[PDB]
Design a protein around this ligand. Structure first.
Ligand SMILES: NC(=O)c1ccc[n+]([C@@H]2O[C@H](COP(=O)([O-])OP(=O)(O)OC[C@H]3O[C@@H](n4cnc5c(N)ncnc54)[C@H](OP(=O)(O)O)[C@@H]3O)[C@@H](O)[C@H]2O)c1
Ligand SMILES: NC(=O)c1ccc[n+]([C@@H]2O[C@H](COP(=O)([O-])OP(=O)(O)OC[C@H]3O[C@@H](n4cnc5c(N)ncnc54)[C@H](OP(=O)(O)O)[C@@H]3O)[C@@H](O)[C@H]2O)c1
Lengths: 642, 642
């Protein structure tokens, strides 16, 4: 079986992150069998040493000599650590000289929560481990690769990272989905810069065979929605409503005449549509669900003590039995199985084998290979240019609305939008949330007339966008339309260096992390906070490309547009599963080609009008009667191109 | 080099169409080296025999014995011939028993003309050779494959067939582009039906190294546009305007005071921006350009004798010299080269090698592998669901408009659209072009009030849609909005048979050809005729999928939607290069999933309103002042999903 592999990658040096187990261990093993010298990177030393022993023993069996020199290890390597990525490169280069193949395989699961329950630092941690680490290792190894005249960067993405011009929602996994989409987007935009010397592609396998949370999240969403629904028609404070759950008795809450209908019917739902073995039938929640519920309520603006769930009775272990956990696991399994065309789940070996053959192909770059797959999962095509504007009736509902505009560098766009909302659509007020005081003054000067009239308010967010949104809520009231534009423009730095250059001017690893902060994390933070604000319609706006934008800005803007589509599509689905169920969509100011951009003042006037129409389309209210299952999914998680 | 291939496809029987040269010859050669018994199909016997000798000799060199039994040939096999496809299967099955691998490699260039110059029979011929042939061979071999428990269908598509949720315009190659898109769409929709036993994928390579028309087409478009522009501001008939070109002297036409400015300036353009070696500087045209110009004029409604260009002086050979032909070939070459990320053109061998490794992957189906590529070419994302309606100003321009509605089975949609145009938007008249008399009566009854008032006219097209459009032009005047819906619904037949069944009820090869006739050729014929009608805005409407549509109808509807996007995107670009430069876009009534469809009367009301808005968006007039380079490409070749 291994005879087909002999001599396939002979003379090549491969660096494989996550190389001690899973798909990475298999890629490392098969690349070594192919004749390549491999460096396996992971955290645990023991696991790496056991894998090294397995590979070396198998190389000896097929006939290799000096097997110790063909398989090396790098323990204590956490890809989320920049310093650890620098030691990895130094250790690899010291053991084998230049790296031919960079296999960016490591990929953590992430937070595994809905965006509204996802700590900001958790999201950043996933981006560091799964995405930023990929640019970082490329940045260190691409100069060597270019100098020797050849190289290969392979990012191990997922089917769940979507595709070119198509986003895939991955609910409870937004951080993971975005990082996967970014690995693919990187290969797509860096290919023209890394070529002809370096190839850069992605692999996007579907689910693979190898090495409860949908129910625990269901319990959280159910309690939260009922608490918010009961708050609508009950005089008691959220504090007093939460107190009804404090005995943590499902039967008592159901039989409580003093408890609101929404909470009584929820307890009836828990007991009837529940397993009598699992304590999720007798108890309302555990402290993990309680802390998440409290954080949702606190983020939403409700006042409750931090210790409200301190004296909460811990449901005697288990809170969920062995039976109900395996039942949902089998429900998930048959779901994944029933999505697979071939209905025979691929293995880690299958993906690695198909990947090791694909690495031999020298005439592809900027592509996403699917070594396994063909899933029945739903796609959100992203990039529709043909759209008009909402009906005049939906536009008439903007009369007296409260608008939040978030931004700083897109001053012409912010001024135009603010004026369109107040002058054309009779909005009551616009709250301009900027980053800096200079940004606030620039906007107050452009909108002097509306500032004087009390129609345009300014707030300086700095790096505290959430607290700034709370200031706007308390001071000016909850918003209808929310337009989130980036504070920062895209950098104008080289993305590759000259063959014999030091690469000292090329976009650094810290600058790539900053790009993600300002162009991805900025929108995530706004969305996470606004998703709990009832009646909000959020437009996430990507940076602007023009006919004069640099070639590097086109690449970085297209990297952001694709990566953010994964976020927009994921949160679009997540919001339909919440009580507030707001609207979230993406408006793209980035295009793929310079030739498509306006070339004169008339075409620019046309473009800026299209921007206003696209924002109005996604910020016009969707009446509750019109928010059907059919129309609801149509008005969430979409992306349109100006 | 071939040692990696030994035993890779050992025990497999492969049938390769177009197996005597190109990518097919290479796939056949490498599959045989891999241990497979191969059957090479093509037309020329000699070519097949030389390839068979090359492969057999190479198999003997690497160590195989009885090389005559491993490589067979099927000469006189034209894939556009159904009877020839049936002999191919009988001959293959008789030589090797069951076929394991169907390599649908054969693919003719096609007509290599713009849609407006493409004979209807030429387009059908490309569809027969490149697309229908693929279903036909699958239909014959899939029953055997299912019975033995395994099989593989590989359609050799192109980068120019686009991608899932993304269309690629290929100007002058619409027939070719559609056939390539269809090969991919087939793999995408048949995968869930052919699995678990059979794998079905596509390969989409970019341009490959192996074995004038943009200039000849430029000469045709230039003469045509100037003749139409001169007709606008000149009293003389088209006959009399064409007569000015009869001496076929560029210098005389330039120096002719009696000739219109557009024609004089065209001759100045030909001589100045022209090569003095090539007769395209001294002569206006040849009879190939003259016949095409005449057919355009005749199709457009101009009266001219068939013999107008009979006594035309043939420009002494050459009409285009060796120098100017090679100059444009190098302009094309560097264009393709400057599109390639790696800037090193792949070879036929490279594609075949990457394909032969990919065929070993057992855990993929419904995918499109790119064995070479990563082009800088432009994409039209297809399937935007978020759109509103045109501005009230653009909608006000519909007052007094002439509307053509083409259809038959979508009676509710036709009645609704007709009523929306006449009742809401004050259109002067609607011309309902049906297929049959029963269809005309159904519509006259649903629209009784508008028929009585003289606002709704009916025409029965039968299989003469062009002559029916001419009848509408002469009788009711040229149209503004044109809504082209299919006459026929989608069939309700099985797409696969049971393991031990005869497959006698499964969609036949003739029924698959009929599906293409009614769902692809129907729109092509309308578009080809309407593209020369000044002021027209054409909506090409795909069939309807509902919550109750069969699983086979979902597959066939999605096959059509994807395949037609290639057409819409191609003609969208072609129209911008003509004098009439009409609008052409696609409105999709087909969705990917049943869950997305309306489930109640309120959701259906919403869906039908979305249909009206989508049609209005693409049929609202684009004022000439607003038809800039920027906005013009935005309003052509798009597809939106209802
Ligand atoms: N599994 C699937 O179904 C599937 C499908 C599509 C895509 N993918 C992608 O395939 C890749 C590999 O997935 P897998 O299934 O093989 O995962 P896995 O089994 O969890 O990965 C295990 C390997 O990753 C290492 N690792 C984990 N966290 C690390 C960190 N922070 N830094 C460095 N190494 C780390 C592990 O060792 P230590 O813990 O000792 O560090 C071990 O070597 C990922 O990029 C994933 O997104 C997987
Ligand atoms: N070349 C590229 O750059 C490129 C790029 C992307 C996709 N493709 C696709 O790759 C495939 C192969 O292309 P290629 O470049 O190898 O083309 P090619 O050189 O023109 O194909 C030659 C082979 O096709 C056979 N053939 C031609 N017309 C046929 C017909 N009507 N019936 C049966 N066999 C026929 C030829 O023999 P006879 O004339 O004797 O029949 C010969 O065996 C096609 O499907 C094409 O669409 C090609």
């Amino acid at each position: 079986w291994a005879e087909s592999l002999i001599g396939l990658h002979l003379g090549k040096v491969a660096l494989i992150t996550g190389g001690s187990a899973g798909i990475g261990g298999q890629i490392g093993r098969l690349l070594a069998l192919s004749g390549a010298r491999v460096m396996l990177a992971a955290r645990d030393r023991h696991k790496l040493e056991q894998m090294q022993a397995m590979i070396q023993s198998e190389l000896a069996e097929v006939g290799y000599t000096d097997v110790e020199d063909r398989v090396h290890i790098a323990p204590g390597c956490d890809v989320s650590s920049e310093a650890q990525l620098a030691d990895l490169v130094e250790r690899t280069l010291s053991a084998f000289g230049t790296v031919d193949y960079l296999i960016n395989n490591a990929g953590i699961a992430g937070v595994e929560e809905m965006v509204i329950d996802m700590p900001v630092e958790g999201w950043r941690h996933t981006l560091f481990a799964n995405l930023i680490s990929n640019y970082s290792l490329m940045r260190k190894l691409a100069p060597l690769m270019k100098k020797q005249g050849s190289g290969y960067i392979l990012n191990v993405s997922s089917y769940f990272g979507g595709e070119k011009d198509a986003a895939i929602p991955y609910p409870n996994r937004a951080d993971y989905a975005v990082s996967k989409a970014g690995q693919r987007a990187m290969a797509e935009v860096f290919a023209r810069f890394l070529g002809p010397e370096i190839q850069i592609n992605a692999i996007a396998p579907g689910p693979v065979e190898g090495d409860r949370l949908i129910l625990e999240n269901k319990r959280l969403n159910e309690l939260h929605a009922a608490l918010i629904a009961a708050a609508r028609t009950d005089e008691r404070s959220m504090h007093e409503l939460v107190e009804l759950l404090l005995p943590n008795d499902v039967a008592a809450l159901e039989q409580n005449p003093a408890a609101p209908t929404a909470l009584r019917e929820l307890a009836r739902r828990f007991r009837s549509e529940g397993d009598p073995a699992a304590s999720s039938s007798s108890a309302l929640l555990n402290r993990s669900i309680a802390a998440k519920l409290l954080a949702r309520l606190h983020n939403g603006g409700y006042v409750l003590p931090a210790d409200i769930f301190a004296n909460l009775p811990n449901p005697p272990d288990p809170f969920f039995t062995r039976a109900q956990i395996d039942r949902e696991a089998r429900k998930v399994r048959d779901g994944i199985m029933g999505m697979l065309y071939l209905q025979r789940m691929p293995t880690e070996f299958d993906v690695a084998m198909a990947t090791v053959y694909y690495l031999a192909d020298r005439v592809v770059s900027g592509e996403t290979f699917h070594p396994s797959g063909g899933l029945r999962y739903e796609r959100t095509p992203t990039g529709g240019e043909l759209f008009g504007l909402p009906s005049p009736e939906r536009l008439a509902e903007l009369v007296g609305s409260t608008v939040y505009l978030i931004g700083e560098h897109l001053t012409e766009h912010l001024n135009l939008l603010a004026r369109a909302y107040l002058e054309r659509y009779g909005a009551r007020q616009v709250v301009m949330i900027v980053e800096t005081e200079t940004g606030a003054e620039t906007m107050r000067r452009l909108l002097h007339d509306h500032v004087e009239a009390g129609r345009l308010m300014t707030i300086v967010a700095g790096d505290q966008i959430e607290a700034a949104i709370d200031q706007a809520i308390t001071r000016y009231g909850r918003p209808g339309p929310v337009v989130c534009t980036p504070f920062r423009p895209l950098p104008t730095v080289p993305l590759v260096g000259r063959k014999d250059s030091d690469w000292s001017t090329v976009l650094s690893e810290a600058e790539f992390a900053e790009l993600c902060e300002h162009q991805l994390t900025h929108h995530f933070r706004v969305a996470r906070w606004i998703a709990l604000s009832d009646g909000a319609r959020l437009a996430l706006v990507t940076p602007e490309t023009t006919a004069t934008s640099t070639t590097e800005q086109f690449a970085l803007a297209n990297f952001i547009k694709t990566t953010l589509h994964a976020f927009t599509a994921t949160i679009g689905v997540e919001s339909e599963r919440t009580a507030q169920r707001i609207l979230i969509n993406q408006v793209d100011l980035t295009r793929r080609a310079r030739a498509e951009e306006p070339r004169d003042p008339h075409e620019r006037q046309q473009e800026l009008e299209r921007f206003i129409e696209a924002v109005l389309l996604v910020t016009a209210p969707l009446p509750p009667e019109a928010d059907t299952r059919y129309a609801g999914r149509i008005h969430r998680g979409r992306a349109i191109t100006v």
